[PDB]
């Protein structure tokens, strides 16, 4: 059960999630998005824990925890991380150059609050360094996330790596055989072959005919959390819908939702996304920590030359049929007669929200699933 | 399995089907087309049987069986008709209607029944309503009411009428689910939509999509894979003219060799299509000019009357599209909501059972 300080930081992490999601969604180089608000917040905590003066205060400001004291930030984020331990695997490792030795007090605190691991790596042996990072991520996620990055640009600073595996476990499972091959429309001119999973059930649903979008709430195991999916009616870039996506608009949409018979079709499989949050966090106010000249990470090691080179947020999010069983007489009940369609064969936004606290576990978007390009025979 | 003589006549009936289909498709008055090549061939065979000199030889020439002997032609088409008589519903009737005054020759009656299962009837065309009632009742009984009417009017009342009444219902090798039926709009033209009932099914079918010629071709096997229904359709709504220019015996062979078994989501109009053609003017255009003209006609073997001529060749068909059949990768769509061409081919011989087109289904 969440303490008042952890409950406060859950608010600040969710606020930062919307902030970070929006910044990344504006970046044209970004396709799929997968963000864990608590994990993103924890990274700033580590900067606030390992940094001094302006480097540390900027991290607190990005988190919007200016009024909060260092103690409640670290203990509160630590409590939040522990609360999430639906199958979920998380690993945090700080990689520094072979020359540097991390401060004993920092090692104690980062392991205590953030379960942060510490590793000295020789970036000069590029292949070996990448192999070490990728093997660590692979073991953390039991092979679900076998690779973080194919290249490390900044080789003179600290790398923070977060390796994650998340698999939503439905409150009402999909039938294991209700799986087939469909075409996913990345654009109206680009189709990718995907595996789709299907289910007709009673779900909280809303169709905005004015804003031309659909919103469905999929409860997770034991109704402790829910997966919310936002999708336009037509195949279009998510930009328009992302302009509408605010904490207040989400509250409006959710109050308009009603339990209806919905026929859901979702892509099935693992979505692997690696983000380097470095430039994005800098854009949000973490400028000093990422610049070699201005960085003050003296609490982390004892050397001013040490800076934050990267913040890797690597996630393997699995869409599968597995969930809790349900009574089969549900279908004999005409409640499920003429369902609404939630046919996710084009880009959508999704959120994983704790039903009780309202805390955001995940925020993301599926723009381009893994699969081969098809030819829409009927396309003109 | 077909004898070498029936096999040769099967080639010529199918060749004639393409020739006749093309002639009728050029006629702007013609909407839907429904032709049974063997039945059309048999009609010419009857003209050769009941006719002498140029009347008979023209019939043989239209059939392209000039090289063959009269007997070989009659026996081979007769074998063909019989061979196409398994788990698919098919009803066929052939009746020769002559004026009340005329009496058919006993030997002709024997031979036309033997080879062509042709019935003979004397009718008084002066009592128009009674004459039409007799023809329509005969066609209805033949098709068990599926084809209740042949024609609303008989123009030429002084000659012989050949009436072919048919009912054909393809029985699928893999049935459609009885509940997978709904109402859709059929695009007759880009500006004209008619409300139809559609039946749907996703399955493994021989399919080919010509990206260049902007058309799709699907093969739907019939009960026990003894025959197949082939559907040819442009990607979008357009007049069939462009596609009909491509439709040759050789091009169909090319397309069929290019087909591959793929997952296909089929949507077809469901119901009975009733088509009555008077092949008289079309067979005349193909070379049967003498049998069709009262002055030149020689049907002396048929009765003993020179005045006797071929007034009409009614090819009346009721073709039913239904869900019924035998129990059973990202699919391609074969969404038949616009005009298409279809063929029914015996998988073994290659012989064409049917050639047609659905341009305007019944509906509002």
């Amino acid at each position: 059960m969440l303490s008042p300080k952890a409950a406060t930081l859950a608010e600040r992490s969710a606020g930062l999630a919307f902030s970070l999601y929006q910044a990344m969604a504006k970046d044209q180089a970004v396709e799929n998005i997968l963000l864990s608000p608590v994990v993103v917040a924890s990274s700033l905590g580590l900067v606030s824990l390992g940094g001094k003066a302006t480097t540390a205060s900027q991290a607190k400001a990005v988190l919007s925890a200016e009024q909060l004291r260092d103690e409640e930030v670290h203990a509160g984020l630590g409590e939040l991380l522990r609360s999430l331990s639906v199958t979920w695997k998380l690993g945090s490792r700080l990689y520094g150059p072979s020359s540097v030795s991390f401060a004993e007090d920092f090692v104690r605190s980062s392991k205590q609050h953030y379960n942060c691991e510490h590793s000295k790596i020789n970036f000069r042996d590029k292949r070996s360094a990448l192999q070490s990072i990728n093997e660590w991520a692979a073991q953390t996620t039991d092979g679900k996330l076998p690779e973080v990055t194919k290249d490390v640009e900044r080789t003179d600073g600290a790398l923070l790596v977060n390796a994650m595996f998340f698999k939503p476990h439905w409150d009402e499972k999909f039938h294991h055989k209700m799986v087939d091959n469909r075409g996913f429309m990345v654009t109206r001119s680009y189709t990718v072959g995907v595996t789709m999973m299907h289910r007709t059930g009673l779900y909280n649903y809303y169709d905005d005919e004015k804003e031309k979008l659909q919103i469905v709430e999929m409860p997770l195991a034991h109704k402790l959390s829910s997966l919310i999916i936002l999708m336009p009616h037509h195949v279009e870039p998510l930009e328009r819908l992302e302009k509408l996506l605010t904490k207040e608009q989400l509250k409006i949409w959710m109050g308009k939702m009603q339990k209806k018979a919905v026929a859901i079709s979702l892509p099935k499989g693992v979505v692997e996304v690696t983000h380097d949050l470095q430039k994005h966090l800098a854009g949000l106010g973490l400028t000093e920590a990422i610049d070699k000249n201005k960085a003050d990470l003296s609490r982390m090691s004892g050397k001013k030359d040490l800076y934050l080179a990267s913040v890797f947020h690597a996630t393997a999010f699995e869409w599968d049929t597995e969930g809790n069983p349900f009574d089969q007489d549900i279908y004999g009940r005409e409640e499920l007669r003429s369902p609404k369609l939630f046919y996710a064969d084009h880009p959508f936004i999704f959120l994983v929200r704790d039903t009780q606290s309202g805390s955001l576990l995940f925020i993301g978007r599926l723009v381009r699933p893994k699969g081969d390009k098809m030819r829409d025979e009927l396309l003109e | 399995m077909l004898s070498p003589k029936a096999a040769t006549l099967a080639e010529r009936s199918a060749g004639l089907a393409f020739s006749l289909y093309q002639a009728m498709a050029k006629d702007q008055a013609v909407e839907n087309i429904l032709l049974s090549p063997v039945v059309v061939a048999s009609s010419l065979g009857l003209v050769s049987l009941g006719g002498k000199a140029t009347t008979a030889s023209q019939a043989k020439a239209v059939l392209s069986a000039e090289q063959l002997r009269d007997e070989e032609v009659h026996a081979g088409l007769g074998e063909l008709l019989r061979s196409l008589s398994r788990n698919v519903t098919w009803k066929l009737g052939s009746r020769l209607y002559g004026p009340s005054s005329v009496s058919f020759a006993e030997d002709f009656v024997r031979s036309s029944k033997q080879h062509y299962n042709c019935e003979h009837s004397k009718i008084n065309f002066r009592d128009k309503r009674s004459a039409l009632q007799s023809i329509n009742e005969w066609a209805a009984q033949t098709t068990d009411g599926k084809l209740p009417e042949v024609t609303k009017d008989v123009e030429r009342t002084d000659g012989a009428l050949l009436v072919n009444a048919m009912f054909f219902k393809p029985h699928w090798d893999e049935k459609f689910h009885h509940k997978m039926v709904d109402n859709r709009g059929f695009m007759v033209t880009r500006s004209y939509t008619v409300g139809v009932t559609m039946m749907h099914r996703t399955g493994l079918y021989n399919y080919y999509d010509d990206e260049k010629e902007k058309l799709q071709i699907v093969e739907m096997p019939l009960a026990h894979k003894l025959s197949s229904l082939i559907i040819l359709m442009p990607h979008h709504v357009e007049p069939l003219e462009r596609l009909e220019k491509l439709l040759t015996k050789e091009q169909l062979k090319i397309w069929m060799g290019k087909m591959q078994k793929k997952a296909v989501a089929i949507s077809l109009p469901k119901g009975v299509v009733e088509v009555t053609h008077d092949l008289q003017k079309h067979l005349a255009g193909l070379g049967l000019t003498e049998a069709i003209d009262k002055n030149k006609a020689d049907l002396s073997r048929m009765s003993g009357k020179k005045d006797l001529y071929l007034a009409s060749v009614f090819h009346a068909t009721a073709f039913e599209w239904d869900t019924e059949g035998n129990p059973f990768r990202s699919p391609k769509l074969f969404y038949a909501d616009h005009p298409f061409i279809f063929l029914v081919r015996d998988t073994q011989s290659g012989s064409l059972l049917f050639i047609g087109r659905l341009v305007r289904p019944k509906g509002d």
Binding site: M185, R188, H198, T200, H234, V235, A263, Y331, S338, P339, L341, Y343, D345, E380 | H177, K179, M180, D182
Partner: peptide, 16 residues
């Protein structure tokens, strides 16, 4: 017994 057929698919995309 086997289930009923699934729901009708969504409407196709608009033309070019």
């Amino acid at each position: 017994p086997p289930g009923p057929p699934g729901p009708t698919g969504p409407r196709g995309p608009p033309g070019p």
